[PDB]
């Protein structure tokens, strides 16, 4: 356990943007530079290669927590299809042996992409439900950042 948490999002390029500017910048430096947690981004950490799904697989392993952000974006990609096609990220869920922050910022009005996602829930053990306002929640100590930080590590 290398990390406190592994931050997992999706950015699709050019549909809110303020949703954007949370998910990529505001949540991972108020994490890291304000409050001092240790998180992986593929995005930033890792380079992608013939090895990608192992070291995706290591990493997570290695996370102690797994930050979901539930963006427009991250529905239209389906960026949790990686937890469900690797064999051990899928046992990892299920099992509980990784708790799961899932980080709701928009309201799933599509019925196939609701049903999707419920399912999903269900196939976590350990699943938190943290709800972003908005701007309101962006805010420095605010009620979504203390739930938050109450469901991180340490």
């Given at each position: 356990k290398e990390?406190?948490?592994?931050l997992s999002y999706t950015k699709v390029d050019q549909d809110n943007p303020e949703e954007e500017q949370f998910a990529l910048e505001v949540l991972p430096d108020?994490?890291?530079?304000?409050?001092?947690?240790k998180l992986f981004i593929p995005e930033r950490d890792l380079i992608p290669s013939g090895t990608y799904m192992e070291d995706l697989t290591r990493y997570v392993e290695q996370s102690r927590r797994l930050i979901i952000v539930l963006t427009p974006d991250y529905?239209?990609?389906?960026?949790?299809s990686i937890f469900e096609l690797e064999s051990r990220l899928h046992n990892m869920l299920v099992s509980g042996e990784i708790k799961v922050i899932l980080?709701?910022?928009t309201e799933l009005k599509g019925k196939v992409?609701?049903?999707?996602?419920?399912?999903?829930?269900?196939?976590?053990?350990?699943?938190?439900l943290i709800k972003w306002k908005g701007s309101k929640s962006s805010k420095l100590?605010?009620?979504?950042?203390?739930?938050?930080?109450?469901?991180?590590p340490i």
């Open positions: 990390y406190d948490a592994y108020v994490l890291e530079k304000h409050y001092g947690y529905i239209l990609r389906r960026g949790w980080i709701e910022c992409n609701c049903q999707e996602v419920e399912s999903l829930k269900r196939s976590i053990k350990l699943l938190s100590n605010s009620k979504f950042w203390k739930h938050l930080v109450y469901e991180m």
